[PDB]
Amino acid sequence: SNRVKNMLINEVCLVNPLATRVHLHQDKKEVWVLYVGPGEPKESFACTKAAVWNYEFDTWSFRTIPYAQCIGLVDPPVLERGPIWSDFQEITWDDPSIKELVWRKDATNFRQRVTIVGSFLKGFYQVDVGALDYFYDRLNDVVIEKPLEMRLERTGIDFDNVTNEWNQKHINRFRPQTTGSGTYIFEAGGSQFSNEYGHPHTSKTYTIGVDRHVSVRLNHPYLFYNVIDNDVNSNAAINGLTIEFAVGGRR
Amino acid sequence: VWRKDATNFRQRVTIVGSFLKGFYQVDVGALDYFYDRLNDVVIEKPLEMRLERTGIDFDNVTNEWNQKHINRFRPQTTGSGTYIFEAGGSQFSNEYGHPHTSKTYTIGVDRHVSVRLNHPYLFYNVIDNDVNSNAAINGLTIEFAVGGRR
Amino acid sequence: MPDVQYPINTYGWLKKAVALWADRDDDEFVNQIPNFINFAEKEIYRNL
Amino acid sequence: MPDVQYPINTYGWLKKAVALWADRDDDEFVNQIPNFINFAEKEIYRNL
Amino acid sequence: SRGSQYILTATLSPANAPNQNITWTSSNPNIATVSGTSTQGTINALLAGFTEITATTEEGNRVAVCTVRVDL
Amino acid sequence: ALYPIKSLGAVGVIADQAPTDLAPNAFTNAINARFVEQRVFKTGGNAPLS
Amino acid sequence: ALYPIKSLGAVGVIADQAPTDLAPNAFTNAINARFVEQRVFKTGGNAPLSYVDEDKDLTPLSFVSMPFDYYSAGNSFLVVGTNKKLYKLTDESLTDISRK
Amino acid sequence: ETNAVVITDLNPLYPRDRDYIYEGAAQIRLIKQTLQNTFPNVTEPVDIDSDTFKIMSEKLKFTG
Amino acid sequence: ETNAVVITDLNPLYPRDRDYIYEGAAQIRLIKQTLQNTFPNVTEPVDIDSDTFKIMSEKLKFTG
Amino acid sequence: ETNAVVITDLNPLYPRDRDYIYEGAAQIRLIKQTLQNTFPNVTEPVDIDSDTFKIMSEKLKFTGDAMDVGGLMIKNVTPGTGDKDVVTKGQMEA
Amino acid sequence: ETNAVVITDLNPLYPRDRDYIYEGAAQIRLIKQTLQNTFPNVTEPVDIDSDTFKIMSEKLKFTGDAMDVGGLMIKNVTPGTGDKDVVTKGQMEA
Amino acid sequence: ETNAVVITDLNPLYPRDRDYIYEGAAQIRLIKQTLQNTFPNVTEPVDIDSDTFKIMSEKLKFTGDAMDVGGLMIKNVTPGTGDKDVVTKGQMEA
């Protein structure tokens, strides 16, 4: 209604709305609406971005897909449908065109079915797998793989529920309670106003198992924090935060 | 315009069959076409918004009849623009108070509006006559004291 | 709102630094800053 | 990231350090650091 | 001008024509080349020298038109 | 005590009612305004079309 | 007083709304994220996939996972289509079953 | 692996999300090397009767 | 792959990092049977001895 | 399909002129951001002097610098050219 | 635009709600003028090898006493220098 | 519209504010290809140099003699110039 309406209409009404699609990601209780990215040719139908919605908790989120012309569910190849020691009679440790293999990959179904994509890059692609993103480049006409980049962003943290908005607030620490292993890249900033997306002030990496917090120094009244996870070997999580802050003055 | 804000995936626009010999869009950038019978000509001018609330007795905080010195309004706006705040009051509750001052709250520079009143019944108005403004008002926070009565 | 230079050398810049150091600045206020300065200087020279 | 030097020995580095220990980076505040330092030096030397 | 390529359109007399096709021709194509359908997309190579862009309807009457490009 | 004035767009114009007995997030008169549950901003104007 | 920030995943992205009038467990923008009612973590990325080495040079437009077929044994396969032809793959070989 | 932390005190637990099974031979050869290093000269340990082990574990501190 | 059943029987580098993967099971089985036959009497608690933990790895000599 | 995302390296034929109008001020902002990031300090970089790079193309080969035969009689202190004070001091000491 | 703030530090971001696309030529000509002003005398910058840039960015502070890397070699003759060019004089003449 | 591919090739005023708008794409493409071909080696980080940021925009001259002699420290590594101590020891030893 008044959460992502003006965002989806804007992002879909630019290039090609008729290419919008949907898929029931019952494996994890998610129903995303595929659509073409903001910057693409007007003659393209390869959906690039997706707005995923969880019908179990009513939350909206977005992501990127590898230029999906279609989508569907199907069982994986024999090498991923559950292999056997006495099957690799012709395979060796020299990874003959196969490296992305794992002993026990996380499953979302009893029959171990995988969601596959019919990509515009001349081949199939899995949509929900380990951290890796395949971004296409028109300059050299080549496919490029890079770590999956997550970004969280919230602006205008006025602490109105605690103290007055206009009052300046010295920010010192964020004390999160994460789970798993990983290495985040925290960013923070602010602005003396409420309308502007504040400018950054610092950035720190919160590696789990060593650090228990992130130290940032701000005194702008309107804070904003961002979270980034560009690592490939990270499967961490963020349950909640606890910001330490003081109160200065105004005017 | 390069990219105008859209309200639909197919980018459909609401059109009007006007009495001014032509069509007109109803929801577009700040511009209002007011007709004049004197010279029989169409006139375009900025779109004038006006908010108005009277009889702010603060009964939920202090007593109504008590006089209250008004000093500041601390809004929390969004976007860019330039508002024109107006404020006033009256020693009674039935009358639409007379204005006392007026200030412009340009966003990105000012963080508040300074007005000086002590009438017990305050009223504030908001006007936006600018053409290049797309601001917004989420809420206010009035700073006030309490004098006496009678 | 108004600006000012590092040294407050004259009345012209003092009457603006007054409105600066107090966000309570507007038409009905700046016009009386001269009266406030008059009262302050009187209170000063009365015993200084 | 206003960065000052370890041997604070000048006026510019002092100004930057004042703006640092008061993290607010805004023209409304930075442009008056000279006035604050003026008041401070006039408060110290007046009885030192 | 240099490099600029303006698109020309050719609206046939009848609103529709079945099995219709156009093969644009221009003497000395080394100056420019066009083909396809009603959409021409004339390309310019030099900064001077007039040209005679004439249509050649595959079907229909051989009767065509002529246009005089002006690079200056 | 606290005196916040939030959700200026939760409710819009309320006339025909004692203005000294309404909420702070209401208005006795409005024109060319648009509210969505937390906010207020100028309504889109008009323009010709041919 | 207390200032806890819990249930970071109870509600996700809330745009088109005054960011200075939301809850601490909300975000004005997100991408490649996944929330389950108490938590947030990076969404699973992407990766290629090839039943055979012949499909890596194909631009499919649609497909369906047919589970059974008279000729096929108790094993599923795919019915994928392209701009001109319809193909079938069952992890062993590619075949063009386009109507002749 | 991560670094030359190689020592006869191994780290069974893995991230378990991505292991690159082709590296299994590396772990097997590492285990073989560690087992050969801990017991360089050994053919077939027998005759212990699993009785002197207990007396040695209880009668420790062979220092003077 | 060796056909031995005891320790110090196969080069840890024998996999070559090029051998076929179907031999991994035969390597794990070989390792397990070797560990079992080299210490068939280990059934009581771990009974850590570590050879006195300090010096007896070299001073424990009996030649003449 | 959105091609208005480029940094430090652009593509002239990606715009594909026969495209929607959103391509425009977006590309202009991209060009401005790239120019600012590449060199966010510019007052008057005139260190060329009518294409001196052609004759001064010796920057890549810092082994055989021109080293004009001129004596370069501008030196303050170096571990090279020594004074004759050691000659006088040595003669006096022995 | 708003005023003569014109300088070689541009402002990509626009209000984005109304831009009057016919003004695009103004922005293009402004960009052209700024690019011609920042580099008045330039034809084709090449031969840099993108290697001296890093040494210059790390070896900054060219003010009197700088630290630089270059033709560091045996440096025997270097016309106009010492290195066994004045010792031989005292040796022979004596 | 010019048919050149390098800088200082087209008058910023050539659009005239009267030319047709369909040429904007050709102008943006020209600008982008010029920026690409004038600095084809810029792929590493921005590597801001700004010509020393202070004075080198005019003092960096090389016409008939070089200036700005380097102020390097001792070269104990990569033996180059004849450091005073080494030559003195060699001379006194013989």
Numbering used by the authors:
A (entry chain G): 755 to 1005
B (entry chain G): 856 to 1005
C (entry chain B), D (entry chain A): 3 to 50
E (entry chain G): 303 to 374
F (entry chain G): 2 to 51
G (entry chain G): 2 to 101
H (entry chain H), I (entry chain C): 4 to 67
J (entry chain I), K (entry chain H), L (entry chain C): 4 to 97
From the study:
Escherichia coli phage SU10 belongs to the genus Kuravirus from the class Caudoviricetes of phages with short non-contractile tails. Here we show that the virion of SU10 has a prolate head, containing genome and ejection proteins, and a tail, which is formed of portal, adaptor, nozzle, and tail needle proteins and decorated with long and short fibers. In contrast to other short-tailed phages, the tails of Kuraviruses elongate upon cell attachment. After binding to the host, SU10 tail, nozzle proteins, and short fibers re-arrange to form a nozzle that extends the tail.
The dodecamer of SU10 adaptor proteins forms the interface between the dodecamer of portal proteins and hexamer of nozzle proteins. Six long tail fibers are attached to the sides of the adaptor complex. The coiled-coiled part of each long tail fiber is held by fiber dock loops from two neighboring adaptor proteins. The hexamer of nozzle proteins, attached to the adaptor, is decorated with six short tail fibers, and its central channel is plugged with a tail needle. In the SU10 virion, the Ig-like nozzle domains are organized into an L-shape arrangement. The first two nozzle domains form a blunt tip of the tail, then there is an 82° turn and the remaining two domains point towards the capsid. Nozzle domain 4 interacts with the short tail fiber dock loop from the nozzle protein located counterclockwise. The short tail fiber is attached to a fiber dock loop from a nozzle protein. The fiber dock loop contains tryptophans 839, 847, and 857, the side chains of which are arranged in a pseudo-threefold symmetry. The position of the short tail fiber is additionally stabilized by the interaction of the central domain of the short tail fiber with residues 71–78 of the long tail fiber.
